[PDB]
Amino acid sequence: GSAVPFHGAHQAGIATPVQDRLHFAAFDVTTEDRAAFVALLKEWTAAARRLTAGHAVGEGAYGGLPEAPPDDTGEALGLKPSRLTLTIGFGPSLFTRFGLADLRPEALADLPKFPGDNLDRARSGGDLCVQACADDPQVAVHAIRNLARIGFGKVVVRWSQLGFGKTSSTTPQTPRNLLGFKDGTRNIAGTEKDRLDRFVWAAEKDGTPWMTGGSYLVARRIRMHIETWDRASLQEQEDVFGRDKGEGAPVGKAKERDEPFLKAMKPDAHVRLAHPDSNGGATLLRRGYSFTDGTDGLGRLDAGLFFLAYQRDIRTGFVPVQRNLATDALNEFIQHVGSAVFAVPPGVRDADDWWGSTLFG
Amino acid sequence: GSAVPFHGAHQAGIATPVQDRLHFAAFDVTTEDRAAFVALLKEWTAAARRLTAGHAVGEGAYGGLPEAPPDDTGEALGLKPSRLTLTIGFGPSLFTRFGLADLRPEALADLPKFPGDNLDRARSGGDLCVQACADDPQVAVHAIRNLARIGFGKVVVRWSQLGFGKTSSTTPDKQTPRNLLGFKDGTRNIAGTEKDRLDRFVWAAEKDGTPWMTGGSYLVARRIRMHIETWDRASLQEQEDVFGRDKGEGAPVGKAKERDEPFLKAMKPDAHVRLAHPDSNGGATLLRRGYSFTDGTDGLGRLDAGLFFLAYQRDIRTGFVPVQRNLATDALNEFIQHVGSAVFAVPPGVRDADDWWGSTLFG
Ligand code: HEM
Ligand code: HEM
């Protein structure tokens, strides 16, 4: 049973190895009391220490007083830690509370409206987020379900998204997204300490001292028009990305990890427009997950990519790259239907520290 | 990661060990051409052979004519079979088509209305279903997607349900999974090794009155929402009283081990296990094979959570119906609500490479 250390200078779940499953939940805060919210962050941190070690929260899921509800709802009993990481983030709307308005980082910028946005307000925004990643989806769901229960009366669940990537028990190998293309070939790796400092981690010179060691998260629920995509020819699909579908190699190259020659790609191929060379060097840490929630009323597959990007500054990461996708040939086949941004605070340093301690003090 | 044999006297995915993930899809038929629908069954069967072996459908996911869409959508490239099983069923409404009226099995009975039902007609019923079970969700989605794509113009997806984790067991030698109420679910089920119990309670026999159905089974699907807010503020004793088993071990009340036999008189008269036990239902026994689901939030600040209940039986009238009628006074009813329902006749297995889904009905 593998576990990921909860404590560190950075929150786990960003540069740590990508787990198979995701349960992402945005919460809205319903209390105005700063002291009550800080108390909740401490209880949540205590619970997160237990959950990421594979233990039940509080006094356990059974064996307590019969007249009392158990502290843990119990559906993770007998399961492994499953590399569970719990990553918290603070939304822009949180800073309108608790007198925090002047502590919102400038790097936590509102996203502009992008062409083709069809954002569902109910699946967007949120005062805070908890990203729960694990190899077992029931471990992730158990974590979110119990954090929400502990927070009841102080927070509510605004929206939640289940996601999946590869299945590590059977898969060695770049995963493929639901379009059939390898996804993640040219990404910041967790082993690239220098590129993380340059592009992912907030530094104290960036202007917000309490965010040092943290990062900024952009979440985009991107629906795929599956049935339209599946009717396109193989050449159209490969032209859209600039990589072949079988190997994932850039056009004109042989291997997946051959560095691309952007001029051989069509001008509005996804890779050519998203590449850092096309965006003044802007580089992103993509950590998204595929989703399939079912089928809509027309019988179409409600599926897509729950896109998650971590970066040092939203204005120099997601925004320029996404702006450059305005003519992306991929736009024919996708629609952004949900969006949120979060400031992901630094890590919990030790057993006495707590989520958001550098912001709330 | 290994493959589950596709051929057999029975369809796989019933007595098969329960895989981690579920993608259940109900289809409606849009063609009146019996020959066109038979051709779709053969085309689906050939696809299933490829999918359950871990191979792309048709000519493959790439390498073909650049100007044509690939035969396989390709998102399962490089993945193992992952114990994928594909189980097809026929809904009662199918038999209004293709001159099949007199071939409806009597064991494929319409369920009566049960107290507490709030069935959404959009996520209920269906001419046919495909149950895709696999350990890898992408493998299960890939199978359903390519089957639906192959069936474009002849079938449409009516509704689908994804199960993120199993709440059932056909392998008592393995650890029993827990449902979202935190209890072990599947302790006293029918095991895939229990050939005598499967013949008695699961597989239809020729003497049951419908010859084409011999070796098949009958499927009841019930989408059940859980009131987890109400459940999570119940005391431990209340929760254990609801079921008649303790929460930690899952042992019957008063007993020490999960698989000790229940002593029914020690549970509350409205305990779920006491009411659902075969001894309480004239011996009626089910093969439960359900999965948990969560489809976001309920719009009221809470996680949506539920159980997609799947039951296989020799005859719906002698399996699910008497058991569900006896759960009218179930203490669990305070915490659940049936919101979707569908029954299907699950035809016999594909015998070999020449055979095809539904061949005994059509053929
Ligand atoms: C459903 C939506 C999307 C799909 C299916 C998709 C798919 C892909 C694929 C197949 C690649 C090439 C393989 C790789 O290097 O990972 C790629 C690259 C990339 N994509 Fe996307 N993408 C989507 C949305 C986005 C969005 C919204 C952004 C940013 C705003 C983005 C940014 C990038 C970047 C930075 C790369 C790396 C390019 C490089 O450095 O070579 N993608 N994507
Ligand atoms: C959300 C819905 C349900 C939940 C959470 C649930 C939970 C449980 C639990 C915890 C057990 C004890 C462990 C076991 O033997 O599996 C059990 C047993 C059982 N349940 Fe349910 N159940 C649900 C719905 C149903 C329904 C609708 C039926 C039938 C119509 C049913 C039939 C049975 C049967 C036959 C047993 C085995 C009893 C025995 O032979 O000892 N369950 N269930």
CSV table of N, CA, C and O in Angstrom, one decimal, chain B residues 71-148:
chain,number,residue,atom,x,y,z
B,71,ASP,N,-12.1,2.7,-37.4
B,71,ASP,CA,-13.2,1.8,-36.9
B,71,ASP,C,-13.3,1.8,-35.4
B,71,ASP,O,-14.3,1.6,-34.9
B,72,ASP,N,-12.1,2.0,-34.7
B,72,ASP,CA,-12.1,2.0,-33.3
B,72,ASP,C,-11.7,3.4,-32.8
B,72,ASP,O,-10.7,4.0,-33.3
B,73,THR,N,-12.4,3.9,-31.9
B,73,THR,CA,-12.2,5.3,-31.4
B,73,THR,C,-10.9,5.5,-30.8
B,73,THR,O,-10.4,6.6,-30.6
B,74,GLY,N,-10.2,4.4,-30.3
B,74,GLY,CA,-8.8,4.4,-30.0
B,74,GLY,C,-8.4,4.8,-28.6
B,74,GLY,O,-7.2,4.7,-28.3
B,75,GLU,N,-9.3,5.1,-27.7
B,75,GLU,CA,-8.9,5.5,-26.4
B,75,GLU,C,-8.5,4.3,-25.5
B,75,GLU,O,-8.1,4.5,-24.4
B,76,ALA,N,-8.7,3.1,-26.0
B,76,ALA,CA,-8.3,1.9,-25.3
B,76,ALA,C,-7.0,1.3,-25.8
B,76,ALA,O,-6.6,0.2,-25.4
B,77,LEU,N,-6.4,2.0,-26.8
B,77,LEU,CA,-5.1,1.5,-27.3
B,77,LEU,C,-4.1,1.4,-26.2
B,77,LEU,O,-3.9,2.3,-25.3
B,78,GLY,N,-3.3,0.3,-26.2
B,78,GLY,CA,-2.3,0.1,-25.2
B,78,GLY,C,-2.8,-0.3,-23.8
B,78,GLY,O,-2.0,-0.4,-22.9
B,79,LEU,N,-4.1,-0.7,-23.6
B,79,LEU,CA,-4.6,-1.1,-22.4
B,79,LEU,C,-4.9,-2.6,-22.4
B,79,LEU,O,-5.2,-3.2,-23.5
B,80,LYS,N,-4.8,-3.2,-21.3
B,80,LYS,CA,-5.1,-4.7,-21.1
B,80,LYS,C,-6.6,-4.9,-21.2
B,80,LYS,O,-7.4,-3.9,-21.1
B,81,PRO,N,-7.0,-6.1,-21.5
B,81,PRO,CA,-8.5,-6.4,-21.4
B,81,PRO,C,-9.2,-6.0,-20.2
B,81,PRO,O,-10.3,-5.6,-20.2
B,82,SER,N,-8.4,-6.0,-19.0
B,82,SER,CA,-8.9,-5.5,-17.7
B,82,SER,C,-10.2,-6.2,-17.3
B,82,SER,O,-11.1,-5.6,-16.7
B,83,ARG,N,-10.3,-7.5,-17.6
B,83,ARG,CA,-11.5,-8.4,-17.2
B,83,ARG,C,-12.8,-7.8,-17.8
B,83,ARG,O,-13.8,-7.9,-17.2
B,84,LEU,N,-12.7,-7.2,-19.0
B,84,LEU,CA,-13.9,-6.6,-19.6
B,84,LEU,C,-14.9,-7.7,-19.9
B,84,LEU,O,-14.6,-8.7,-20.5
B,85,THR,N,-16.1,-7.5,-19.4
B,85,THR,CA,-17.3,-8.4,-19.8
B,85,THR,C,-18.4,-7.5,-20.4
B,85,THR,O,-18.6,-6.4,-19.9
B,86,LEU,N,-19.0,-8.0,-21.4
B,86,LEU,CA,-20.1,-7.3,-22.1
B,86,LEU,C,-21.4,-8.3,-22.0
B,86,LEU,O,-21.3,-9.3,-22.6
B,87,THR,N,-22.4,-7.8,-21.3
B,87,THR,CA,-23.6,-8.6,-21.1
B,87,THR,C,-24.8,-7.9,-21.7
B,87,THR,O,-25.1,-6.7,-21.3
B,88,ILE,N,-25.4,-8.5,-22.6
B,88,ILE,CA,-26.6,-7.9,-23.4
B,88,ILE,C,-27.9,-8.4,-22.8
B,88,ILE,O,-28.0,-9.5,-22.4
B,89,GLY,N,-28.9,-7.5,-22.7
B,89,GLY,CA,-30.2,-7.9,-22.3
B,89,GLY,C,-31.2,-7.3,-23.1
B,89,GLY,O,-31.0,-6.3,-23.8
B,90,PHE,N,-32.4,-7.9,-23.1
B,90,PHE,CA,-33.6,-7.5,-23.9
B,90,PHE,C,-34.7,-7.0,-23.0
B,90,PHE,O,-35.1,-7.8,-22.2
B,91,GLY,N,-35.1,-5.8,-23.2
B,91,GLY,CA,-36.2,-5.2,-22.4
B,91,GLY,C,-37.6,-5.7,-22.9
B,91,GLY,O,-37.7,-6.1,-24.1
B,92,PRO,N,-38.6,-5.7,-22.0
B,92,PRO,CA,-39.9,-6.1,-22.5
B,92,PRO,C,-40.4,-5.3,-23.7
B,92,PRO,O,-41.2,-5.9,-24.5
B,93,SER,N,-40.1,-4.0,-23.8
B,93,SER,CA,-40.6,-3.2,-24.9
B,93,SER,C,-40.0,-3.7,-26.2
B,93,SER,O,-40.6,-3.4,-27.3
B,94,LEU,N,-38.9,-4.3,-26.2
B,94,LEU,CA,-38.3,-4.9,-27.5
B,94,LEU,C,-39.3,-5.8,-28.2
B,94,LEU,O,-39.4,-5.8,-29.4
B,95,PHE,N,-40.0,-6.6,-27.4
B,95,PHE,CA,-40.9,-7.6,-28.0
B,95,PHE,C,-42.1,-7.1,-28.6
B,95,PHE,O,-42.9,-7.9,-29.2
B,96,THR,N,-42.4,-5.8,-28.6
B,96,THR,CA,-43.4,-5.2,-29.4
B,96,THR,C,-43.0,-5.0,-30.9
B,96,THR,O,-43.8,-4.7,-31.7
B,97,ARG,N,-41.7,-5.3,-31.1
B,97,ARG,CA,-41.1,-5.1,-32.5
B,97,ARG,C,-40.7,-6.4,-33.1
B,97,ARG,O,-40.5,-7.4,-32.3
B,98,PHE,N,-40.5,-6.5,-34.4
B,98,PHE,CA,-39.9,-7.6,-35.1
B,98,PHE,C,-40.8,-8.8,-35.0
B,98,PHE,O,-40.2,-9.9,-35.2
B,99,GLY,N,-42.1,-8.7,-34.7
B,99,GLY,CA,-42.9,-9.9,-34.6
B,99,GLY,C,-42.5,-10.8,-33.4
B,99,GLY,O,-42.8,-12.0,-33.4
B,100,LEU,N,-42.0,-10.2,-32.3
B,100,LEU,CA,-41.4,-11.0,-31.2
B,100,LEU,C,-42.4,-11.1,-30.1
B,100,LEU,O,-42.1,-11.6,-29.0
B,101,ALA,N,-43.7,-10.7,-30.3
B,101,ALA,CA,-44.6,-10.5,-29.2
B,101,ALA,C,-44.9,-11.9,-28.5
B,101,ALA,O,-44.8,-11.9,-27.2
B,102,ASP,N,-45.1,-12.9,-29.2
B,102,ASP,CA,-45.4,-14.2,-28.6
B,102,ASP,C,-44.2,-14.9,-28.0
B,102,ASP,O,-44.3,-15.9,-27.4
B,103,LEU,N,-43.0,-14.3,-28.1
B,103,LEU,CA,-41.8,-14.8,-27.6
B,103,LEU,C,-41.3,-14.1,-26.3
B,103,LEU,O,-40.2,-14.5,-25.8
B,104,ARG,N,-42.1,-13.2,-25.8
B,104,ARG,CA,-41.8,-12.6,-24.5
B,104,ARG,C,-41.8,-13.7,-23.4
B,104,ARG,O,-42.8,-14.4,-23.3
B,105,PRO,N,-40.7,-13.8,-22.6
B,105,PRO,CA,-40.8,-14.8,-21.5
B,105,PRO,C,-41.7,-14.3,-20.4
B,105,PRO,O,-41.8,-13.1,-20.1
B,106,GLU,N,-42.5,-15.3,-19.9
B,106,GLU,CA,-43.3,-14.9,-18.7
B,106,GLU,C,-42.5,-14.5,-17.5
B,106,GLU,O,-43.0,-13.7,-16.7
B,107,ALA,N,-41.3,-15.0,-17.4
B,107,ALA,CA,-40.4,-14.6,-16.3
B,107,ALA,C,-39.9,-13.2,-16.4
B,107,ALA,O,-39.4,-12.6,-15.5
B,108,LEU,N,-40.0,-12.6,-17.6
B,108,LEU,CA,-39.7,-11.2,-17.8
B,108,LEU,C,-41.0,-10.4,-17.5
B,108,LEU,O,-41.7,-9.8,-18.4
B,109,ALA,N,-41.3,-10.3,-16.2
B,109,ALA,CA,-42.5,-9.6,-15.7
B,109,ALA,C,-42.2,-8.1,-15.5
B,109,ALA,O,-41.2,-7.7,-15.1
B,110,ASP,N,-43.2,-7.3,-15.8
B,110,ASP,CA,-43.2,-5.9,-15.4
B,110,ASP,C,-43.3,-5.9,-13.9
B,110,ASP,O,-44.1,-6.6,-13.2
B,111,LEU,N,-42.4,-5.1,-13.3
B,111,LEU,CA,-42.4,-4.9,-11.9
B,111,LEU,C,-43.6,-4.1,-11.5
B,111,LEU,O,-44.0,-3.1,-12.2
B,112,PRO,N,-44.3,-4.4,-10.4
B,112,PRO,CA,-45.4,-3.6,-9.9
B,112,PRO,C,-44.8,-2.4,-9.2
B,112,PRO,O,-43.6,-2.2,-9.0
B,113,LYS,N,-45.7,-1.4,-8.9
B,113,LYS,CA,-45.3,-0.2,-8.2
B,113,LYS,C,-45.0,-0.6,-6.7
B,113,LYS,O,-45.8,-1.2,-6.1
B,114,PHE,N,-43.9,-0.1,-6.2
B,114,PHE,CA,-43.6,-0.4,-4.8
B,114,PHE,C,-43.7,0.9,-4.0
B,114,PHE,O,-43.5,2.0,-4.5
B,115,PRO,N,-44.1,0.9,-2.7
B,115,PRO,CA,-44.2,2.1,-1.9
B,115,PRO,C,-42.9,2.8,-1.9
B,115,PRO,O,-41.8,2.2,-1.7
B,116,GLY,N,-42.9,4.1,-2.0
B,116,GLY,CA,-41.7,4.9,-2.0
B,116,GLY,C,-41.1,5.1,-3.4
B,116,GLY,O,-40.2,6.0,-3.5
B,117,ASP,N,-41.6,4.4,-4.4
B,117,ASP,CA,-41.1,4.6,-5.8
B,117,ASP,C,-41.2,6.1,-6.2
B,117,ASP,O,-42.3,6.7,-6.1
B,118,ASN,N,-40.2,6.6,-6.8
B,118,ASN,CA,-40.2,7.9,-7.5
B,118,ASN,C,-39.4,7.7,-8.8
B,118,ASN,O,-38.2,8.2,-8.9
B,119,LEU,N,-39.9,6.9,-9.7
B,119,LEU,CA,-39.1,6.5,-10.9
B,119,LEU,C,-39.1,7.6,-11.9
B,119,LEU,O,-40.2,8.1,-12.3
B,120,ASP,N,-37.9,7.9,-12.4
B,120,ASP,CA,-37.7,8.9,-13.5
B,120,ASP,C,-37.9,8.1,-14.8
B,120,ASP,O,-37.0,7.2,-15.1
B,121,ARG,N,-38.9,8.3,-15.5
B,121,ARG,CA,-39.2,7.5,-16.7
B,121,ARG,C,-38.1,7.7,-17.8
B,121,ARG,O,-37.9,6.8,-18.6
B,122,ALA,N,-37.3,8.8,-17.7
B,122,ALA,CA,-36.2,9.0,-18.7
B,122,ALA,C,-35.1,8.1,-18.4
B,122,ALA,O,-34.4,7.5,-19.3
B,123,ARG,N,-34.8,7.8,-17.1
B,123,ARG,CA,-33.7,6.9,-16.7
B,123,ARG,C,-34.2,5.6,-16.3
B,123,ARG,O,-33.7,4.9,-15.4
B,124,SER,N,-35.3,5.1,-17.0
B,124,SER,CA,-35.9,3.8,-16.7
B,124,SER,C,-36.3,3.1,-18.0
B,124,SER,O,-36.4,3.8,-19.1
B,125,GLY,N,-36.5,1.8,-17.9
B,125,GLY,CA,-36.9,1.1,-19.1
B,125,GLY,C,-35.7,0.9,-20.1
B,125,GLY,O,-34.6,1.1,-19.8
B,126,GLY,N,-36.1,0.7,-21.4
B,126,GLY,CA,-35.2,0.5,-22.4
B,126,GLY,C,-35.4,-0.8,-23.2
B,126,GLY,O,-35.6,-1.8,-22.6
B,127,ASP,N,-35.2,-0.7,-24.5
B,127,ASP,CA,-35.4,-1.9,-25.4
B,127,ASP,C,-34.3,-2.9,-25.1
B,127,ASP,O,-34.6,-4.2,-25.2
B,128,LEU,N,-33.1,-2.5,-24.8
B,128,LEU,CA,-32.0,-3.4,-24.6
B,128,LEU,C,-31.0,-2.7,-23.7
B,128,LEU,O,-31.0,-1.5,-23.6
B,129,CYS,N,-30.1,-3.5,-23.1
B,129,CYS,CA,-29.1,-2.9,-22.3
B,129,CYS,C,-27.8,-3.7,-22.6
B,129,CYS,O,-27.8,-4.8,-23.0
B,130,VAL,N,-26.7,-2.9,-22.4
B,130,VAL,CA,-25.3,-3.5,-22.4
B,130,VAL,C,-24.7,-3.2,-21.1
B,130,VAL,O,-24.5,-2.0,-20.8
B,131,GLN,N,-24.4,-4.2,-20.3
B,131,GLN,CA,-23.6,-4.0,-19.1
B,131,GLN,C,-22.2,-4.2,-19.4
B,131,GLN,O,-21.7,-5.3,-19.7
B,132,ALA,N,-21.4,-3.2,-19.3
B,132,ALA,CA,-19.9,-3.2,-19.4
B,132,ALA,C,-19.3,-3.2,-18.1
B,132,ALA,O,-19.4,-2.2,-17.4
B,133,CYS,N,-18.6,-4.2,-17.7
B,133,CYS,CA,-17.9,-4.3,-16.4
B,133,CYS,C,-16.4,-4.5,-16.7
B,133,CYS,O,-16.0,-5.4,-17.5
B,134,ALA,N,-15.5,-3.7,-16.1
B,134,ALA,CA,-14.1,-3.9,-16.3
B,134,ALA,C,-13.4,-3.3,-15.0
B,134,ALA,O,-14.0,-2.6,-14.3
B,135,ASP,N,-12.1,-3.6,-14.9
B,135,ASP,CA,-11.4,-3.0,-13.8
B,135,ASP,C,-10.9,-1.6,-14.1
B,135,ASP,O,-10.5,-0.9,-13.3
B,136,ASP,N,-10.9,-1.3,-15.4
B,136,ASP,CA,-10.4,0.0,-15.9
B,136,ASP,C,-11.6,0.8,-16.5
B,136,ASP,O,-12.3,0.3,-17.4
B,137,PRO,N,-12.0,2.0,-16.0
B,137,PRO,CA,-13.1,2.7,-16.5
B,137,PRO,C,-13.0,3.0,-18.0
B,137,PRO,O,-14.0,3.0,-18.7
B,138,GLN,N,-11.8,3.4,-18.4
B,138,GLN,CA,-11.6,3.8,-19.8
B,138,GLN,C,-11.9,2.6,-20.7
B,138,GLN,O,-12.5,2.8,-21.8
B,139,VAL,N,-11.6,1.4,-20.3
B,139,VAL,CA,-11.9,0.2,-21.1
B,139,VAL,C,-13.4,0.0,-21.2
B,139,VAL,O,-13.9,-0.3,-22.3
B,140,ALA,N,-14.1,0.3,-20.1
B,140,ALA,CA,-15.6,0.1,-20.1
B,140,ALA,C,-16.3,1.2,-20.9
B,140,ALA,O,-17.2,0.9,-21.7
B,141,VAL,N,-15.8,2.4,-20.8
B,141,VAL,CA,-16.4,3.5,-21.7
B,141,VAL,C,-16.1,3.2,-23.1
B,141,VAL,O,-17.0,3.4,-24.0
B,142,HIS,N,-14.8,2.8,-23.5
B,142,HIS,CA,-14.5,2.6,-24.9
B,142,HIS,C,-15.4,1.5,-25.5
B,142,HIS,O,-15.8,1.6,-26.6
B,143,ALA,N,-15.7,0.5,-24.7
B,143,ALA,CA,-16.6,-0.6,-25.2
B,143,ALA,C,-18.0,0.0,-25.5
B,143,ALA,O,-18.6,-0.2,-26.6
B,144,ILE,N,-18.6,0.7,-24.6
B,144,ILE,CA,-19.9,1.2,-24.8
B,144,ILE,C,-20.0,2.2,-25.9
B,144,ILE,O,-20.9,2.2,-26.7
B,145,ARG,N,-19.0,3.1,-26.0
B,145,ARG,CA,-18.9,4.1,-27.0
B,145,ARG,C,-18.9,3.5,-28.4
B,145,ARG,O,-19.6,3.9,-29.3
B,146,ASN,N,-18.0,2.5,-28.6
B,146,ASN,CA,-17.9,1.9,-29.9
B,146,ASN,C,-19.1,1.0,-30.3
B,146,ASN,O,-19.4,1.0,-31.4
B,147,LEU,N,-19.7,0.4,-29.3
B,147,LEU,CA,-21.0,-0.3,-29.6
B,147,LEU,C,-22.0,0.7,-30.0
B,147,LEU,O,-22.8,0.4,-31.0
B,148,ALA,N,-22.2,1.8,-29.3
B,148,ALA,CA,-23.2,2.8,-29.7
B,148,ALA,C,-22.9,3.3,-31.1
B,148,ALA,O,-23.8,3.5,-31.9
